[PDB]
Write a protein that binds this ligand. Structure first.
Ligand code: ZN
Lengths: 514, 76, 321
């Protein structure tokens, strides 16, 4: 497959989430919160409340959305699943990536964990489930590992949810196939199919024994299934829209639910008529995590489309549709996500509208924000900043992370030649030559690579710029900061990943013909 | 902008077009995914077989538009 | 007062003759054309030639005969260099050209009276319909509807099926996944989606085009699909729309444009039309009656044992007036 160079216009440290959180994780041992963001960055927060700055650090390695995060090995070790088709093994205490399991062939949507067996499951859109031993993934000893992958077979459609009981004797998958498939993870053999749902299962929950299962579908129904009976024992219709997130009390007699309708409800499973409304969020609920410090749970952490993570106090359920909450007690801040983007007639500048309706002017080539225009009309501004020039397209933009990501592809990268004077690069008193924008940039990106030795000789790209090399399909090859190209190990990596089309103009410096 | 093409088997494929893109250039993008040479392709939209010279903007083809890919059946 | 007339083939012009036959047996079209003839603009365009031709057929002394459509064909060659040749062409391509060409003539005529928001021509009143493409992003679950007009429907075809089943899966919810992921504007990423095309507004005449071709990506050539694909004499079509009013229109097979030949690069086009209860076949100049059972039973093909496989290509379904 063909390789594409990509970079991200952002600041070295992106402290706050910039696209909403797909999954949450709470460490009871250290009172820490893990937020798997759609900005491809996992972050650590302190939940002691009485801390002005809750931010601890951020785990940056992923390239697309982090869909799920499983925290294991009694304290810290984090397993992540992402739309970047990989599963990453992290030492959660220090916050660094150990291994990248490149076994999935599509977006890895969900992870499942069985504490009593140090077993972790992974599933995604590629209709395949893989079982992993955490103690094997974390082991550094390498004693005749002969690392053979273990997979479950059955799924006829893209998997959106996974769940495993604490003992690791039951595993259930949720997909667009509507029906939920079950296996014995220990023996890998099939168990049952559970027909009942008229839509997608995005939320799956199991008790300790695994004798019963809770499911939240996009059809709006919560279902309690009896595994020993192989049938649905209770159907709960609470939300007006689909249900995406689920959380249960230690007993397994109350279900905490959230969906597209932004409402969060704790419903008594035993008798559904006793349904309590926690609150209504400002964005649809993606995933939830309970404060399991005491029974009943005293708080609940809510992840939504919005980059701000809220903690709502449950304390009042025993005393108390009017909600129990109006304002959260603890709030993790969130930065703006670029929702709209326009490339102007000069293929150098970009206009963007963030979630806060602020409009910004950007320089693609010099990889930076040139101006802040504030809360103005974006549509009118595009028309107001019209340029009477023809420059062919040479780059791609993607706001999947909420941050600006530019993609240089072989097919059109060297398509745009502009005059040095017309490009702003005033050179007195040398006549303005025709410069190839793509080339000039590629040079500025791999400026610190010894193989290329100085730079483009006109402008400089911020030295903290993430420079990613990956296949058009999805698989990333290598990732590094612009300034890190100089290091031995990085320079070696560049030599094994940088494609020939890039090498032709960066090292060989054979500038294309008009 | 992304438009759809209903292939010869009914399978829908996505295309990453621009309104400025010519009909012959749309065909080339289809060739990459399907393998069909443009000379052999025929695209129907809004009951109109799209002319090679024209662009998508001309035919008012916007995001989410479904082009119907079809071939010839020469007869005398 | 019925006129069953053949049409002379002037060197691989069957693709053209066969469409004219089918169009002549679509009474709203024929009546409309004949009416256009009457005004007599007298400026030679493809529409005037068509009307002059349809007029000869309609106002002939004998009920059965043969007409050389030289005049029309001359204009078709003058008006289109891709048809200005003795090469064999596609009937559907001709139909599309002819219908849009004569709609565009009318679109101009409609505008020239206003001279001394858009308007729909009588070509559209007869063959136009409207679809609604709904696209549900599977991540945010926001549904995006989009209306798109149609003059005919190019249906996919499967081995040992019916025109109804093909119409059924044409309107079925397909999943956009893997390499075909949908770009969701609210998600700002590519996500799996459900795509469904349902009928919003029914055409007075449903023109069905069967995608009877298979491309061989490796062999670098395409084949003709001569599958047994059955077509009913009647079609039940129901309406989606506003849901304030609902339509359950019953259609009737008026004409079938059929392509004879084992391959897609060469062949012969004929038309079978239903006129006054009984069916009749038009092979250029030759016009002969055919028994109802011998119609559908010969337009498919079982296994391979059927010489130069005659297959149904364009189907004309007329509303019950
Ligand atoms: Zn979406």
């Amino acid at each position: 497959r063909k390789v594409q160079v990509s970079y991200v216009i952002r600041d070295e440290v992106e402290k706050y989430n910039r696209n909403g959180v797909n999954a949450l994780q709470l460490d009871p041992a250290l009172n820490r919160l893990f937020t798997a963001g759609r900005d491809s960055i996992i972050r650590i927060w302190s939940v002691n409340q009485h801390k002005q700055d809750p931010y601890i650090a951020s785990m940056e390695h992923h390239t697309d959305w982090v869909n799920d995060i499983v925290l294991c090995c009694n304290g810290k070790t984090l397993i992540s699943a992402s739309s970047d088709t990989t599963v990453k093994v992290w030492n959660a205490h220090k916050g660094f990536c150990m291994s990248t399991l490149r076994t999935h062939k599509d977006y890895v949507k969900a992870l499942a964990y069985a504490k009593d067996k140090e077993l972790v499951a992974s599933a995604g859109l590629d209709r395949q489930i893989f079982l992993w031993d955490v103690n094997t993934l974390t082991a550094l000893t390498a004693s005749n590992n002969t690392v053979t992958t273990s997979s479950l077979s059955g799924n006829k459609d893209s998997i959106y949810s996974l769940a495993m009981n604490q003992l690791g004797t039951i595993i259930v998958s949720g997909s667009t196939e509507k029906v939920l498939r079950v296996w014995d993870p220990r023996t890998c053999a099939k168990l049952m199919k559970l027909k009942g749902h008229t839509d997608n299962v995005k939320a799956l929950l199991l008790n300790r024994d695994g004798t019963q299962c809770l499911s939240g579908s996009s059809d709006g129904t919560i279902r309690l299934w009896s595994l020993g009976q192989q049938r649905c024992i209770a159907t709960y219709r609470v939300h007006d829209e689909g249900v995406w997130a689920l959380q249960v009390n230690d007993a397994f007699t109350h279900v905490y639910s959230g969906g597209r309708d932004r409402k969060i409800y704790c419903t008594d499973l035993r008798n559904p008529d006793i349904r309590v409304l926690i609150c209504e969020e400002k964005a649809p609920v993606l995933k939830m995590e309970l404060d399991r410090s005491a029974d009943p749970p005293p708080a609940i952490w809510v992840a939504t489309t919005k980059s701000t993570v809220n903690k709502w106090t449950l304390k009042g359920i025993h005393n108390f549709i009017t909600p129990l909450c109006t304002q959260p007690d603890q709030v993790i801040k969130g930065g703006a996500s670029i929702i709209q983007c326009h490339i102007l007639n000069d293929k150098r500048h970009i206009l963007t509208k963030d979630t806060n309706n602020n409009v910004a002017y950007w320089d693609v080539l010099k990889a930076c924000k040139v101006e802040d225009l504030g809360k103005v009309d974006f549509e009118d501004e595009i028309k107001k900043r019209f340029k009477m020039v023809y420059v062919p397209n040479w780059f791609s933009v993607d706001l999947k992370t909420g941050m600006l990501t530019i993609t240089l592809d072989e097919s059109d990268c060297f398509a745009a030649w502009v005059s040095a004077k017309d490009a702003g690069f005033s050179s007195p008193d040398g006549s303005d030559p025709k410069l190839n924008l793509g080339g000039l940039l590629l040079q500025a990106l791999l400026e610190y690579w010894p193989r290329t030795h100085k730079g483009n000789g006109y402008f400089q790209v911020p030295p903290h710029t993430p420079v990613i090399f990956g296949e058009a399909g999805g698989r990333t090859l290598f990732r590094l900061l612009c300034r890190d190209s100089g290091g031995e190990t990085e320079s070696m990596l560049l030599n094994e990943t940088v494609p020939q089309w890039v090498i032709d103009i960066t090292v060989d410096k054979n500038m294309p013909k008009f | 902008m992304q438009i759809f093409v209903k292939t010869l088997t009914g399978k829908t494929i996505t295309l990453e077009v621009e309104p400025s893109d010519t009909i012959e250039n749309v065909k080339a993008k289809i060739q990459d995914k399907e393998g069909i040479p443009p000379d052999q392709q025929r695209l129907i939209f809004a009951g109109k077989q799209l002319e090679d010279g024209r662009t998508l903007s001309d035919y008012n083809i916007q995001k989410e538009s479904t082009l119907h890919l079809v071939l010839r059946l020469r007869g005398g | 007062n019925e006129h069953y007339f053949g049409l002379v083939n002037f060197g691989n012009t069957c693709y053209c003759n066969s469409v004219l036959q089918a169009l002549y047996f679509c009474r709203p079209f024929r009546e409309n054309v004949l009416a256009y003839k009457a005004q007599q603009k007298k400026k030679e365009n493809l529409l005037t030639c068509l009307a002059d031709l349809f007029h000869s057929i309609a106002t002939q002394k004998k009920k059965v005969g043969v007409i050389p459509p030289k005049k029309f064909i001359s204009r078709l060659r003058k008006e289109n260099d891709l048809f200005d040749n003795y090469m064999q062409q596609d009937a559907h391509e001709f139909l599309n050209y002819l219908l849009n060409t004569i709609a565009d003539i009318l679109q101009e005529e409609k505008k020239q009276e206003k001279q001394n928001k858009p308007e729909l021509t009588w070509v559209h009143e007869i063959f136009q319909g409207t679809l609604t493409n709904e696209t549900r992003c599977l991540n945010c679950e926001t549904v995006s509807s989009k209306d798109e007009d149609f003059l005919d429907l190019s249906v996919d075809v499967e081995q040992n099926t019916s025109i109804t089943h093909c119409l059924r899966d044409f309107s079925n919810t397909e999943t956009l996944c893997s390499e075909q992921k949908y770009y969701c504007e609210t998600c700002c990423s590519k996500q799996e989606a459900q795509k469904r095309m349902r009928v919003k507004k029914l055409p007075m005449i449903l023109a069905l085009h069967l995608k009877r071709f298979k491309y061989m990506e490796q062999l670098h050539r395409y084949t003709k699909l001569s599958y047994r694909v059955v077509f009913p004499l009647e079609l039940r079509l129901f309406n989606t729309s506003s849901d304030a009013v609902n339509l359950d229109r019953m259609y009737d097979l008026v004409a079938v444009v059929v392509h004879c030949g084992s391959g897609p690069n060469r062949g012969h086009y004929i038309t079978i039309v239903k006129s006054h209860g009984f069916w009749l076949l038009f092979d250029d100049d030759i016009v002969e009656k055919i028994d109802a059972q011998a119609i559908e039973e010969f337009y498919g093909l079982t296994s391979d044992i059927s010489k130069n496989s005659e297959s149904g290509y364009i189907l004309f379904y007329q509303s019950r007036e």
